[PDB]
Paper text:
The PT [name] from [name] DSM 1042 reported here is a member of a new type of bacterial prenyltransferases, as it catalysis the prenylation of a phenazine substrate. The overall structure of [name] belongs to the PT-fold family and is characterized by ten antiparallel β-strands that assemble into a circular β-barrel.
However, methylation of the [name] lysine residues allowed us to grow needle-like crystals (200 mM magnesium chloride, 30% (w/v) PEG4000, Tris hydrochloride pH 8.5) of methylated [name] (EpzPm). Unfortunately, the EpzPm-nat crystals were not suitable for soaking with substrates because the active site is blocked by a symmetry-related protomer from one site, whereas the aromatic binding site is blocked by a PEG molecule. Comparison of EpzPm-nat, which lacks diphosphate or sulfate in the binding pocket, with EpzPwt and EpzPm-SPP revealed different side chain conformations of W119.
Author numbering: 3 to 290
Write the structure that this text describes.
Amino acid sequence: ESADLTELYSIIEKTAQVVDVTASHDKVWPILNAFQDVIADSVISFRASTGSSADDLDCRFTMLPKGLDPYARALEHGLTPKTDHPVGSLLKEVHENLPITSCGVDFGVAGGFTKTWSFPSAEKLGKVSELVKLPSIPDAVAANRDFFEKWGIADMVSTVGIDYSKRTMNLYFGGGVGDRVPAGVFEEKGVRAILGELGLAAPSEELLKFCERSFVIYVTLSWDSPKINRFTYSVMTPEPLGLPVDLAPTFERLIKSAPYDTEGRNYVYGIASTPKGEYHKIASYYQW
Ligand SMILES: [Cl-]
Ligand SMILES: [Cl-]
Ligand SMILES: [Cl-]
Ligand SMILES: [Cl-]
Ligand SMILES: [Cl-]
Ligand SMILES: [Mg+2]
């Protein structure tokens, strides 16, 4: 399957160029070699960003099997260094104490290994009450326990992302046929209240219209701040050109001119609110 990795690299290099990023052969090939045994059956997607994060393109391999510890694999191959910071111990704690059924890894095509993904199945979700007991959890989860309880989302953790490069964590809520994020989270009063409570930028008119199409949210937390770092609404659609947003030129190019067919496939779009403003994300699915 060495020639398979060669085609995949060639797709990664070109897709990077579509969004004005240059892939690093020296960073990406070790990752392809490290995960060669799980790439064929993985879901592979490319995620572009506006704002500061526009300087790299993320590549994600998801739906990786139970029995792969993707952080351990990255450590084993020297793709990321050992650390005593709790970020390095959280994955194992989450995998034991939340009903995780598959996983994933995430890398910048220029920057190298950045994140792991831990996925419960939609039929049985994770709980904030179990997260707050984990030795390596950010203190900010319990520090915002009021927020998760207020908005009725504490028992519907649907994905955990761990970013080793930034020392942040993402908690997703909602998705698939699982428990639903309450409707009030997506109505204007709710969007204003949430962003206000979290000290984030007041929602734009574009964000309000986008929120009407959303049923997945995720919260970004860190170990070094008691405050939620950002709040992101997500929308899944096979017609991203029809989203009620103005698309960045790089996003339009990724939709229209990727080196592969996404005919029919869903894209995943996000709008992140921070204390300074709104930044967008779009994921295109190469292998599904
Ligand atoms: Cl993110
Ligand atoms: Cl509801
Ligand atoms: Cl996103
Ligand atoms: Cl998203
Ligand atoms: Cl910011
Ligand atoms: Mg259910």
